[PDB]
Design a protein around this ligand. Structure first.
Ligand SMILES: CC(C)(C)NC(=O)[C@@H]1C[C@@H]2CCCC[C@@H]2CN1C[C@@H](O)[C@H](Cc1ccccc1)NC(=O)[C@H](CC(N)=O)NC(=O)c1ccc2ccccc2n1
Lengths: 99, 99
């Protein structure tokens, strides 16, 4: 699709069998989801944003389906008001910015 | 142009006639700049993201040219390490996400 930015670019994703709403975020290096259970091992990590750093759980090689397009990559899980799909998965689905 | 997401989408902007590097950021509602002492009135504002809220200075109707595409709007000045161009200006330059 082509998505404009008059509203937040929120889309539906599927992960671990569940549907969620997530923000397509070109400013985010990483994908950060709200606290949730995901299968498999995770590693404690920290990541930083506009307000400072938080602790997250790092899950590797997690399948995520984003508007029907498939990605498999690192998903971080931690305290967050919005699910954010970052460049690590946006690149996998061939997402670009155009103007 | 088309900006891919293999690296951070950093581009040149012009503000106050001077050139800066800034992140095209579809996950940002607002445009938030590194510390700079713009003339004129401003208002305090709180903005948040991962890690919490920060205090910023809000300046209105500031011209910002993004890769030669002119915009004008609100800019917030804060302690962040990178300038971010958010949807308030991305919409003005006709920027879309495409995949
Ligand atoms: C998500 C990770 C941590 C991987 N990346 C970022 O947060 C990066 C960090 C760099 C470096 C520091 C300066 C900021 C940049 C860019 N961000 C990415 C952003 O796109 C970031 C993503 C985000 C969106 C929503 C919540 C949390 C993170 N956007 C913001 O921080 C902006 C700042 C702003 N006011 O423009 N935020 C929001 O747009 C926003 C919308 C709604 C909302 C609701 C409740 C609480 C906060 C909040 N923030």
């Amino acid at each position: 699709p082509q998505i404009t930015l008059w509203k937040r670019p929120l889309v539906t994703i599927r992960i671990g069998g569940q549907l969620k709403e997530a923000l397509l975020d070109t400013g985010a290096d990483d994908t950060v989801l709200e606290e949730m259970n995901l299968p498999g091992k995770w590693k404690p990590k920290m990541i930083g944003g506009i307000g400072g750093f938080i602790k997250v759980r790092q899950y590797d090689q997690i399948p995520v389906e984003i508007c029907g397009h498939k990605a498999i990559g690192t998903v971080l899980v931690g305290p967050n008001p919005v699910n954010i799909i970052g460049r690590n998965l946006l690149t996998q689905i061939g997402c670009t910015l155009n103007f």
